[PDB]
Design a protein around this ligand. Sequence first.
Ligand code: FAD
Ligand code: ADN
Ligand code: TRP
Ligand code: TRP
Ligand code: CL
Lengths: 527, 527
Amino acid sequence: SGKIDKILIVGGGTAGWMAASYLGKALQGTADITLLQAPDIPTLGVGEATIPNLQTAFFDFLGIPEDEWMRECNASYKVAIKFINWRTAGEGTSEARELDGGPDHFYHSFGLLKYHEQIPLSHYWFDRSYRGKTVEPFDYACYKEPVILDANRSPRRLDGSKVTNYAWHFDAHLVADFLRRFATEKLGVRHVEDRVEHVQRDANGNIESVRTATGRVFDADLFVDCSGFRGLLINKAMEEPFLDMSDHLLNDSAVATQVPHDDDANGVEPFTSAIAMKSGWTWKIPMLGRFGTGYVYSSRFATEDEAVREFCEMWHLDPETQPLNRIRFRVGRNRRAWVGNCVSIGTSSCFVEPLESTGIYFVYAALYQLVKHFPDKSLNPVLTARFNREIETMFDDTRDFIQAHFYFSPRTDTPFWRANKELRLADGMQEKIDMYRAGMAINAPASDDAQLYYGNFEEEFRNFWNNSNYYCVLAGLGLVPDAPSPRLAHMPQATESVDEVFGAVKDRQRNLLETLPSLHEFLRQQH
Amino acid sequence: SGKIDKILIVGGGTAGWMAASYLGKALQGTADITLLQAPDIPTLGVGEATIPNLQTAFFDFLGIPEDEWMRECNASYKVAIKFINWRTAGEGTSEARELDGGPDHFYHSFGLLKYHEQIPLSHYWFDRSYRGKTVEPFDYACYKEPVILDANRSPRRLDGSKVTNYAWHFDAHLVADFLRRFATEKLGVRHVEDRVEHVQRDANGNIESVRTATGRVFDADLFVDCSGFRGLLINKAMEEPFLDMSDHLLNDSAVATQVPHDDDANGVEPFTSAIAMKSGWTWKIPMLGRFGTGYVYSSRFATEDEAVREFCEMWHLDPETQPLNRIRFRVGRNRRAWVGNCVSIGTSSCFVEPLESTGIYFVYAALYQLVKHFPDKSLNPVLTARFNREIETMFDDTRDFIQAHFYFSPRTDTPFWRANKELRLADGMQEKIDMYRAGMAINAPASDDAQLYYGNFEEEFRNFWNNSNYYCVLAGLGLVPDAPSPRLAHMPQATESVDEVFGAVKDRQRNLLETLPSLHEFLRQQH
Ligand SMILES: Cc1cc2nc3c(=O)[nH]c(=O)nc-3n(C[C@H](O)[C@H](O)[C@H](O)COP(=O)(O)OP(=O)(O)OC[C@H]3O[C@@H](n4cnc5c(N)ncnc54)[C@H](O)[C@@H]3O)c2cc1C
Ligand SMILES: Nc1ncnc2c1ncn2[C@@H]1O[C@H](CO)[C@@H](O)[C@H]1O
Ligand SMILES: N[C@@H](Cc1c[nH]c2ccccc12)C(=O)O
Ligand SMILES: N[C@@H](Cc1c[nH]c2ccccc12)C(=O)O
Ligand SMILES: [Cl-]
């Protein structure tokens, strides 16, 4: 035995520099860490969207205040994903089509639905809706956010005070750079810029060393594969199978760019947009004076050329002239994330389309779990197996949630939208849908206190997709229960007094619409 | 087909009047509830021990102040279970044998272990123990309670202020009677004294009505089976299989009585005792001026006559003339707790020996789950299946935990203690043990805040047997990890600073021991 003394991280980029920073912090002064990465053709900054626990689980762990990193990474704010045109037929367009007297949009906001008499607000909304007491959409009824986001309001007042839960939009290249500087200058991580040419394994099949193009040899007790979709160590050297999951997710490709934006004329949207297309969907990630955008599509339904044309047409770009990243993804996860002394982190481990902003989350969630299940040199098999279980659940739950965005869309207008209805939901997901249709909450949060949830990683990891999230997406798409929760007919006092809860939301919608600065005004001050 | 209009509860006792009270409260004014019970030969009050969520999940739900019910039921206080003679060979005796320089006892107390730098105190204790920095037992190192329980201290100061988490000892008959008065007088529950003679089912297999010995016919939409081990409705009428769990639990019998106690001469113990015997264990449940006591034993290893002698000799009672309850238990659970329109609640549903004070908890836990999954007359099968899943798990996790008390005892002195080592642990339990031996937390609480835990039934129910409970019992019996958590060697600042955490336990131990009144002194004032 003996403790792990030496760690080698293969791969720079976002996953590698997060691994370096997180492990550098968690093990400070008790492990020697080297990061090895090949300088290679850089890509356009197409923007990344994130979730609130980035600050609480990751940057707060490193001891880095939000102000410091967000200014270094020219970050903007995200209060929701705005799902546009998921219910209406037609071409890929940036503009919401008309549906039932209003624009075809719904929001998936941060935070938790309020409990009223032990029951989530969603259930009272649906009861009122089903019985014809309201025609208001779920999101406008139950959340203060949709009204303020429509007006492009800031989540913070000019004095700094926070009025809602929020996360960040940034170019991931800037965060990687920031973290490289942090790990190397403050945590003692050694940075080697060289290309892996050969991986030597021992008779147990564990990694012994890595040899580079220059002939340099690096050994370690633990190897962290951050090599991206290649899986240099986990797939290639350790021969661990990748599990494709295109039986749940048709999308496997993207064409992506960055588009200049006049924030003075137009303001800045405090949300990511997920814009439904003919054969996939397009993201819009507003940053400072630019937005990142990418058409995520299914290569089985659109050629690369059709996707390039569709995408450029929507943003009025010239396909001959616009800088484009064309990407084919690996969709799914390794059979096992950690094998022997090789732990995969980032896209070497797993990947799903960025429909719910989970990419960066999967990196620091895995790093949290790695540290929790941290081995010594005997590599206790129970630690590895438990870590692998946490990763497979983290990923599979997300794969299911995302499939549900396509599966329950009402659209039948293209081969793509119809083909989605013909895939099967995983058993676990079918069960959640059955519960939802019976009027049950799905993974209701133990408390409705958002600070408990976003302030405690263990609490959020156990309840990652919660009832609020399922209702936003399912009810947004138009999937609703077969009938109201049977409980509510036995609670006349509760269904009466819930009216004040809805009034309270209406009050916050009105007062925040009147008092909040624009996101653009706040960003100018903040940066 | 419409809301449930009528509910018939079959069976009184504790489970039936809890069901009546809880449903009467939950559905007040929107369902007609009748409880049907035949008068039966009454038993000696042999005592019941409970857990803190009795007040917060049951009596607080009903609107009943702790002071009110406890004075009506002549209740005492419980701070822990004290396990006596589980590690040493010999006869069934009320006196602890010597082990390693002190008495053979350990405590399973209420509360949660403190987290230090994200890691439960248990892990720091074991690190120190393993490296020979301490020989102090786990319970004495990590809990303030053992010291004050050794001195029979009150959990409340004379001014009423609470210094620890605690629950109750009482004669269950007094609680059943208190609840009968409450439900009939405050909640409009109809009480009918009659004996079920016939259960009429329809062609869907649902119960239509029950006919009594007087010829009265009681119909309802939902039938609650609180008939006890007989399972009048769920087993006899609905023919639901009962799963015997004697491959995990050998104890199936008890002989029990009540002993007068002079509390002025001797004081009152603020704990349940669980006293290891040759072929089982004996409870001691202090009440006011008396204790309830019962030898739980395996009919495979002792005859009724033998258990009677061992039990009576322990307490110096005449086996020929002492009033005794001779009980054969039905150990295990139904394949399904709820079938068609018939829900089992209490021992008609499931039973395990009272080794961890779960019997009353299983009643209001299931009642909370019933209201959560409450049907209308269409009896949506998803509600029933999900309720059944929550009940299976609540029971099977308790079965597993209880089995571990016998399986990990070091005793080999009687056929009984040896035979327990020849049984298998369930897969899910073996997995927990594997994790524990690897130095992992088992079901670490999301938070170490006991108020959030005991004040939020969802939080507690999802994490019912937590890391604290596993360490009290496993480490108490002497099962410890193979090696310290490998994480800790990378945390030299945390393993240094945890000394203040152990020192604070020691300060609370000393200060509470010096300032607390006896349990008996507080009870005189309280009652
Ligand atoms: C289309 C797209 C959109 C996304 N959108 C979002 C989003 O909105 N929100 C979000 O949170 N996440 C998003 N993500 C996920 C996120 O971008 C990634 O997890 C992360 O930012 C980058 O992945 P990575 O670091 O694992 O891999 P990579 O960036 O591919 O890094 C690979 C590294 O490995 C090194 N390497 C490989 N082979 C060798 C070798 N032979 N020798 C030496 N070095 C080697 C490379 O040099 C490089 O340093 C998105 C991802 C994609 C693909
Ligand atoms: N045949 C029956 N009719 C009515 N109540 C019953 C019957 N059998 C058992 N019970 C009730 O179940 C409880 C036993 O724990 C008692 O209230 C008892 O009256
Ligand atoms: N637990 C996550 C769920 C989530 C992931 N991506 C999201 C995007 C929008 C809203 C919620 C989410 C959160 O509330 O942060
Ligand atoms: N979650 C329960 C666990 C428990 C059941 N029986 C116990 C007896 C003693 C201590 C804890 C328990 C509690 O803390 O109440
Ligand atoms: Cl993503």
